[PDB]
Design a protein around this ligand. Structure first.
Ligand SMILES: *[C@@H]1O[C@H](CO)[C@@H](O[C@@H]2O[C@H](CO)[C@@H](O[C@@H]3O[C@H](CO)[C@@H](O)[C@H](O)[C@@H]3O)[C@H](O)[C@H]2NC(C)=O)[C@H](O)[C@H]1NC(C)=O
Ligand SMILES: *[C@@H]1O[C@H](CO[C@@H]2O[C@@H](C)[C@@H](O)[C@@H](O)[C@@H]2O)[C@@H](O[C@@H]2O[C@H](CO)[C@@H](O)[C@H](O)[C@H]2NC(C)=O)[C@H](O)[C@H]1NC(C)=O
Ligand SMILES: *[C@@H]1O[C@H](CO)[C@@H](O[C@@H]2O[C@H](CO)[C@@H](O)[C@H](O)[C@H]2NC(C)=O)[C@H](O)[C@H]1NC(C)=O
Ligand SMILES: *[C@@H]1O[C@H](CO)[C@@H](O[C@@H]2O[C@H](CO)[C@@H](O)[C@H](O)[C@H]2NC(C)=O)[C@H](O)[C@H]1NC(C)=O
Ligand SMILES: *[C@@H]1O[C@H](CO)[C@@H](O[C@@H]2O[C@H](CO)[C@@H](O)[C@H](O)[C@H]2NC(C)=O)[C@H](O)[C@H]1NC(C)=O
Ligand SMILES: *[C@@H]1O[C@H](CO)[C@@H](O[C@@H]2O[C@H](CO)[C@@H](O)[C@H](O)[C@H]2NC(C)=O)[C@H](O)[C@H]1NC(C)=O
Ligand SMILES: Nc1ccn([C@@H]2O[C@H](COP(=O)(O)OP(=O)(O)O)[C@@H](O)[C@H]2O)c(=O)n1
Ligand SMILES: Nc1ccn([C@@H]2O[C@H](COP(=O)(O)OP(=O)(O)O)[C@@H](O)[C@H]2O)c(=O)n1
Ligand SMILES: *[C@@H]1O[C@H](CO)[C@@H](O)[C@H](O)[C@H]1NC(C)=O
Ligand SMILES: *[C@@H]1O[C@H](CO)[C@@H](O)[C@H](O)[C@H]1NC(C)=O
Lengths: 291, 277
């Protein structure tokens, strides 16, 4: 594998022609009005969400990636290929590390690293893992999780799925209540998928829904000089050993591979395109143990 | 049935010496702090709700019932005993009418009246009847429902059950969003059940939980000269025929009922169990 910087920069420029990444990265205070009704990228149009004073107060003033530049970036997907890879040190050497869905690192650092500079966060995490912040203990656990992120960007897409609606108020209220107590940089993308979908539709990838991993690639393209991908491997066997693999690296040993998404996604089609991109030197896809 | 004003005035005085009704009626802006953690009267202590700026902004400045005095009050429970009663006109002749849980009147006026001066509102009503205000149509329907109340009090107990927590944020955000567009007067009781329970504990009624109906009686005792109860009949069978009756007219309560029946017999209050006409 040898990086082709020219072709990567061309890709960047092509992405930027279709998606204003710096802007799309997050709503800002001055781009929303109090009382504005948002709709959801992936739900029926009837679902709405009214922007409150408090929601607006958590938006950044300027794009958190404006005038930011990182030389080597790691984008870490969640594939079971990472278990046993020992990629953690190599991942953490990156200038900037992107992670998906608040993925755990604690038990897994040797394989996936501990550096996090951005992690994505669907609001429904609060429902699944923090009991809607109903108790003192829930609130404390969520607070600690956030504190461990230090100054990283928490990239919260509250306008993709309508089922985010009522949990988003809880999350907004939690952050307003704790204003100034955490260093996490909040980012809140708006209705961006139609713009992102345009670039990838031209590359002959058009599922109903693009994966978080490729969305992160798209964002990374604008601010990273060189992108190294880890944990992109949507298959139940290891490419080198042929052994069974789980879907996620944090799945217990012996978990059988079963696909998270059907119909809505085309992870194999994503992977194939990224693999082609690897071959063209646009990005480095890692599929084996790290030295 | 004949009112015993003497004994009623004695009851009022006893209730007031155990429960500060005017204060307990609603939290006020200055009685909470932003960031204060509320607990729930009927849930485990571990459940909390943080008071926001916005929640506080919806509290009244002063108890809405301070220095209010009404002559005849109706407290209207939701029993199916009201179906066919034709009590609407008699209920609406009251000076002040208390209703429970935002109960519908329009299709049932002949039996239950259309006068409303206070109605209670469990936040979970948004979940059951207004789809968490997720769509435009839901928001419009809830707005129209609130507008029909005009200047009545909407008495919202958000701190009895922890299952109110998440819907309460939706309700708060809806009211902030619509600030100044409705005339409804909001009231928000806090942790009052242990204080209300004290009076009723001495009357040998001590469930787990007092019902909204008897909570409304209690409040009424402070601002009414005479209280007439309707729709209190916690049984699935008609008192006279024993044929099935629904629970609600718009479809330990028996101990409460027994006490209210005894109170009727003492002339404290009038419990209507039959047709008005
Ligand atoms: C995500 O980025 C896209 C662009 O990739 C943003 O869409 C763009 O929004 C701007 C609004 O400033 C549009 O500019 C306007 O163009 C018209 C001419 O077509 C001009 O008359 C106006 O004065 C203005 O310059 C631009 O057209 C539009 N591009 C597309 C393809 O729709 C989008 O706003 C971003 N979304 C978020 C939530 O950040
Ligand atoms: C930005 O990074 C490039 C590339 O760095 C190399 O590849 C990375 C994946 C990682 O393994 C690095 O340690 C490698 O050095 C840098 O370009 C290299 O610069 C070094 C040190 O001066 C030089 O010896 C190499 O020949 C260069 N390699 C290439 C491919 O150009 C570049 O210097 C970095 N710039 C900054 C400001 O950090
Ligand atoms: C880096 O990638 C670019 C773009 O794909 C390569 O440039 C192409 O080179 C082939 C050689 O036959 C031509 O057919 C294309 O038309 C070229 N395109 C452009 C824009 O130059 C380049 O060869 C790659 N570099 C390396 C070192 O492999
Ligand atoms: C990316 O995030 C990591 C934390 O994951 C940052 O690295 C830490 O930086 C602090 C403050 O300088 C150090 O004291 C820690 O020792 C570092 N931790 C690790 C795990 O490396 C890093 O600075 C961030 N990079 C950015 C924002 O470019
Ligand atoms: C409801 O009214 C009661 C009094 O009937 C209030 O109880 C008093 O509260 C103060 C302040 O906490 C205590 O110091 C007193 O000891 C309490 N008195 C009694 C008799 O218990 C209560 O605070 C009111 N609650 C609300 C929410 O309004
Ligand atoms: C109690 O509530 C009723 C409304 O349900 C009030 O009666 C209305 O008063 C307005 C203004 O005078 C009239 O235009 C309406 O026609 C009345 N409606 C009905 C159904 O009577 C009543 O004034 C309130 N009483 C108190 C004491 O506040
Ligand atoms: N077996 C897997 C699992 C995830 N992935 C990638 O890793 C990302 C993070 O995984 P996830 O399961 O948490 O992601 P989503 O369900 O949000 O897409 C995905 O969006 C994919 O791009 C993969 O390539 N192979
Ligand atoms: N069949 C019934 C229904 C309601 N009720 C009373 O009417 C009140 C209002 O009814 P509800 O069922 O809407 O009230 P909750 O107690 O459920 O808040 C109850 O609290 C009871 O005091 C009754 O006595 N008999
Ligand atoms: C009114 O109630 C009091 C208190 O129990 C009683 O002594 C009095 O005789 C009652 N009057 C009636 C039933 O007329
Ligand atoms: C209260 O209601 C009674 C009974 O209808 C009535 O006769 C009386 O005049 C009313 N007013 C006052 C001030 O008591």
């Amino acid at each position: 594998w040898k990086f082709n910087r020219t072709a990567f920069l061309h890709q960047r420029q092509e992405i930027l022609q279709h998606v204003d990444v710096i802007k799309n990265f997050s709503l800002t205070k001055n781009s929303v009005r109090i009382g504005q009704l948002m709709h959801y990228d992936y739900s029926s149009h009837k679902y709405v969400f009214s922007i409150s004073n408090n929601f607006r107060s958590l938006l950044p003033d300027v794009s958190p990636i404006m005038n930011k530049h990182y030389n080597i970036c790691a984008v870490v997907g969640n594939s079971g290929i990472l278990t046993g890879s020992q990629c953690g040190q190599e991942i953490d050497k990156s200038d900037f590390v992107f992670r998906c869905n608040f993925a755990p690192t604690e038990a897994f650092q040797r394989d996936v690293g501990r550096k996090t500079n951005l992690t994505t966060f669907n609001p429904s995490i609060l429902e699944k893992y923090y009991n809607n912040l109903l108790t003192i203990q829930d609130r404390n656990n969520f607070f600690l999780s956030l504190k461990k992120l230090d100054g990283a960007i928490l990239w919260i897409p509250a306008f993709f799925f309508h089922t985010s609606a009522t949990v988003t108020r809880t999350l907004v209220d939690f952050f307003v209540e704790h204003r100034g107590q955490l260093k996490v940089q909040l980012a809140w993308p708006g209705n961006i998928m139609q713009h992102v979908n345009r670039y990838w539709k031209n590359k002959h990838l058009s599922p109903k829904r693009l994966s978080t991993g490729i969305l992160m690639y798209t964002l990374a393209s604008a601010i990273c000089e060189e992108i190294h991908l880890y944990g992109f491997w949507p298959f139940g066997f290891d490419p080198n050993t042929r052994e069974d693999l789980p879907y996620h690296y944090y799945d217990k040993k012996g978990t059988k591979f079963t696909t998270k998404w059907q119909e809505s996604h085309q992870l194999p089609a994503e992977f194939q395109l990224l693999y082609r991109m690897h071959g063209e030197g646009l990005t480095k896809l890692t599929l084996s143990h790290c030295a």
